[PDB]
Assembly symmetry: D2
């Protein structure tokens, strides 16, 4: 089994040369072909998925189901990626140096992307589409609980690859169900350049401890909205109504004015409120309840904490948060800009809902995942996250 994965790795590396070379038109043609194939086998796909969904119930299961609406979404997603600009081969900043050479960078694919996913058989299409368009070979590793759906989709990918003239190995499915496959895959550093997990925190914690191949991922997010004492209450109500706020931080000076309509609005929608001692007093005096005591671990449910002001807010966020998405509500210009600069999170917001931190809202036109890491790709990740910049030199015979 350690020779099978090695073989998969070798074939990926070799396939990666072909897809790297493939023109914009060929890649888009592959994608459109996979799209039409799905429109064609809608029934067989709906049928196969049902077999999977039935054995599922017979022992999340939502995210496993391919409704007519999910297929439509996968197809529409294929055509979106086709519509996206082809980022490969682009040259930038080709400047002359005193020495005579001209130096710039080229955007090229990473090469080989490993996708490890649980349920979510749509990942089979959505992940591979993005990798393919960005010129990479893809290694797919789904979960047992979706064998037939993934197998069926992976064959349609191959059909699209065949239609475009591309090698079948442009997309490989790890066919086994053997446990040690993932262990080998996340350690296959010669042949795999990055892993994109699409599972729960349980799997993501395993990979974090074990993987030697770099990953694009976020350990599930604790996100904050800090309501400053120079907040507009009106903005705070609109704004505060993986990137969903889990903790509301409110400056002491404005808590009564803000927490009264906020807590009341949240209560009416059925949200449980976990509050620190100060917030409890503010909410009780406003007649808003019931309320649950917040523990230190707390840092359909919302945690609420009172802070002295912006210094304590930034410090709490950088210390306890997941560095995913965090927002400030304030009318004070310097405090707004300070927050943007100092809050060390993947996306930082002034007077806007934390829900806006996703690839489509941000204009990336896609989202392979969301990264809370500092290096390479951070925040919502689009096509570019699956590419690299190398230096290219237009010379004229210069020696050194």
């Amino acid at each position: 089994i350690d020779q099978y994965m090695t073989d998969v790795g070798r074939r990926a590396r070799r396939a990666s040369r072909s897809i790297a070379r493939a023109s914009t038109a060929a890649k888009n043609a592959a994608l459109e072909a996979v799209a039409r194939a799905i429109e064609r086998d809608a029934g067989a796909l709906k049928a196969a998925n049902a077999r999977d969904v039935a054995r599922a119930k017979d022992k999340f299961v939502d995210r496993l189901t391919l409704s007519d609406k999910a297929l439509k979404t996968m197809v529409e997603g294929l055509r979106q990626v086709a519509t996206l600009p082809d980022p490969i081969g682009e040259m930038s900043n080709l400047k002359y140096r005193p020495s005579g050479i001209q130096v710039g960078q080229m955007r090229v694919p990473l090469g080989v992307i490993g996708i490890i996913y649980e349920s979510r058989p749509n990942v089979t299409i959505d992940a591979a589409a993005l990798c393919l368009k960005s010129g990479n070979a893809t290694i797919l590793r789904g979960g047992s609980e979706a064998l037939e759906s993934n197998t069926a989709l992976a064959k349609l990918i191959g059909e699209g690859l065949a239609e475009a003239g591309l090698p079948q190995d442009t997309v490989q499915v790890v066919e086994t169900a053997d446990r040690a496959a993932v262990g080998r895959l996340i350690t296959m550093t010669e042949y795999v350049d990055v892993i994109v997990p699409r599972g729960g925190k349980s799997l993501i914690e395993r990979l974090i401890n074990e993987a030697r191949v770099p990953m694009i991922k976020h350990l599930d997010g604790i996100c904050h909205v800090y309501v400053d004492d120079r907040a507009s209450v009106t903005k705070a109500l609109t704004v505060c109504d993986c990137n969903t706020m889990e903790t509301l931080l409110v400056a002491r000076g404005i808590a009564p004015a803000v927490l009264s309509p906020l807590g009341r609005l949240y209560r009416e929608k059925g949200v449980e409120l976990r509050v620190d001692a100060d917030a409890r007093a503010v909410l009780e005096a406003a007649g808003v309840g019931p309320l649950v005591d917040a523990t230190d671990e707390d840092w359909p449910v919302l945690a609420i904490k009172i802070v002295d002001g912006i210094d304590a807010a930034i410090e709490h966020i950088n210390e306890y948060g997941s560095h995913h998405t965090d927002a400030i509500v304030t009318e004070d210009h310097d405090r707004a800009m300070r927050f943007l600069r100092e809050v060390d999170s993947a996306s930082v917001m002034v007077n806007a809902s934390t829900r806006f931190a996703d690839g489509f809202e941000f204009g990336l036109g896609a989202e392979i995942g969301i990264s809370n890491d500092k290096l390479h790709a951070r925040g919502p990740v689009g096509l570019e996250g699956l590419t690299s910049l190398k230096y290219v030199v237009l010379g004229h015979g210069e020696g050194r």
Copy 2:
């Protein structure tokens, strides 16, 4: 005790990072200038300490010139600090702030990574050079230098601390590991809570041991072959000027042009005492050119290849993906080589030796990367930074 120490250093770096990330351009540049002055006319303590390192070394042997802080080394070191001060501050820069249909305005801000760990050999100069770059890019630094340079590096750390204090920055912005115990290295590269990236420099054996023990990501160069491929449509003249870490280790020559090219190239190299390791075809061409002696397989490997397709395959298979070049006058082949050669720097008609932070216009070189993610090729200030998203909103909810 040594775990407790490295943990403490970690926590201190993380805490200091908030201040240095907040620091103004003027304050960081002032810090650099103060360290420069503090090295000037306080060079005596520096030299005395270095003398002790150099003496403990000789009484063991070998390297000593690399370890030695001559007047020249200090002059270079001081000039470098000032050069780093002249570099534009990349921190806090906002770019591509665009309105979206939803009404929000979304762009990116360049920010420091936070804490950089630097691991190096026994050239004391690196202490100042690496720290200058990390500091200018708004990061806290932890430095572990070679154990044979420990007293020099400790003496340099004190001057850095004084410069920092003069500019109102905290002492812990820069920390030099005060122990020679190598177990500190294992700690530093596994300290993921507190350290954001490791920048290791040194030989392959060091780099290799670091690679399979580290859990903190690294910006590094795992050494190996750099190539120059001389195409059959090469200009012989350009081949001679071009082909004379980023040094050409292997020469690949297209079959069609081998006699015309290997004859003068072989002489060029044999007239510098460079050894020629040759495959069978190259041996034949070189013997017929009267160029020897030759060794079968300061050294150059030489191989005959059929043409460009084989060259690209060879380089992508056998090379270190560091620096590789083609000599050709053919436009499509030049562009193909640039696109398909999967190296950190790829060149058309230029020496692989140009793959350098200063040659490339970065004004700095913290290191070289043959990695694909984050930073690739020679790495300057930007490699010690991150891009995050920033949103200028107006109260929008989704």
Copy 3:
């Protein structure tokens, strides 16, 4: 009163530009989509209005090409509608901030992209310009002043009323788009001199109208007088590439061929062009080459042929230096191409040929806003300043510096 009238239009345009410059992306796109649906709605009525214009036109016996450009068929209409939704789809360029960098002094300085303000559009025939130009101006946050020709009166009027419908539907001031209503020829002269109120002018007509504006305008223009475009076939050209590129404004008016490759290239190219009914105007050397190959008939080229304009001028040159000099001397600096396999020659040509678009091994017919990825085309510019080549939304915007300070004094 033409002065009173036109000055009033200018002040109204300035006032309205303030609103449209502030307009959110959503409001601008809603305005475009409204106009598009409105055209879909009144398609029959618009075609009926256009037929009255065409009938009145063919009565005067106007140039068939002028009349064919006047004609709004279903295809033209659908095409305008597509254009509206294309423009709505384009990213909103306005208000974007870039390169906001800290300086040693402590300030942070960058640039903001903003609208020019007020755009004057002057057009003959082509009633579709009423919609297409207004759309681009509007999306880029500008006020527009439209001056269309007399022969499209009913069409332009109908189309502009629909624009107004869209403005109102999106909450934009009606004066965001104004039409110059009088046919008085004096209005054009005022418009191109109304330097206080109009920031740039985009003319779309022939070389007849452009000539007047060029000599009379004081307001800056985005335009191109004539397209004398070249393909130079280097002696190191791939013959195959030469054949594909040279067979394929924008169109090759002059073919330059290196002496060394002329028999290999001109012989199949000359035959190819004559099998298309293209007149070949040739220099002495190309004539001998073509006569040699049996390609005919041929007209002698005059030196005015190198500066003129189904006719193709052919000239033999020694090589790339002669070719570059000829292009820079006689060309219109619009679009020019080299066919060569030699890398250094290819890069020299890109560098030294002072045209708006320079091509290596590609047909000059690719020099085009859509082919270039601009997603739009307000016009093609052969000027050096501000906008050059095909011009998209950004051509109708300006960059200004913006500074985020902290109380710094100097």
Copy 4:
């Protein structure tokens, strides 16, 4: 003869422009360094011409005087221009298109730059240095009262060019005071691509109405600082202490808190205060004087400070866009939305939040140069550096693709 001479000058500039556009970074920087050494060697023969010029008002004579501090500054400038990156020939955004072609842009020189300037001999060198560095040929018409010194500088620029192997005609200085040269230069559309005029508003205004060649210029006028009612008084004082503030706009609500310490500051520094009725009342209540009644003309006409009270930001923005020269204008405010609004809506070349208008400057903005300042909308706006003397054209890297 003046006419034949000017045409010849144009033709030579066009011919030279090919060589300089092509010239490498090394050759251009070497020309610069060579000029800088030729000034160091022929300094005596140079300072003598200046003397025979300075002899032949005030402080016209000081600005005209090639002091041994201006010759250092001029020489340092050459070397400074040499350190600047070479903007020329850069290719950017070379992207593949679905058709298979690859399309990007290349930055190239405008070609031939006309420089028209006063009797400050340093401009001769400064402006030529910038034009040369950016790959352009230059034609310089300086003040007639510096004609001998500029003729002296011309010979030395010539030296530098020759050393570098660049054509002499890369830089031509007009060898006559005949003002007809100016009329020709600003109409030489065949040979000159842009004019960079530098002087007083009168001259600039003539050129504007007469020039057919495009210009990078600024028609001087009012720059404003608006102090909003949510301004920090502290920031207002440091901020409110050719981009000089000619008019101060103060929100009615903050006027006594700001105008009182500010007025005192100005009066101590000797500034005439021309005030509207409302500012009069506030300043007089604060014991600041004397004051002069502002006219309606004072809001349009450029040591005086004009001070106006406005209701708030809407009235300020409107006043600035109406009366200003669209050069540089600033807001002092702590309110985020108001700060961003001002940046967006104030249609000036440089707009500032909580920073002095005096920062509107090429060096302050990081351009490393200033060929001039522009308050026009097209091409170049604000302080103009090397890039303003360049153009972007499209370049296509193709593979033999056809399209009919």
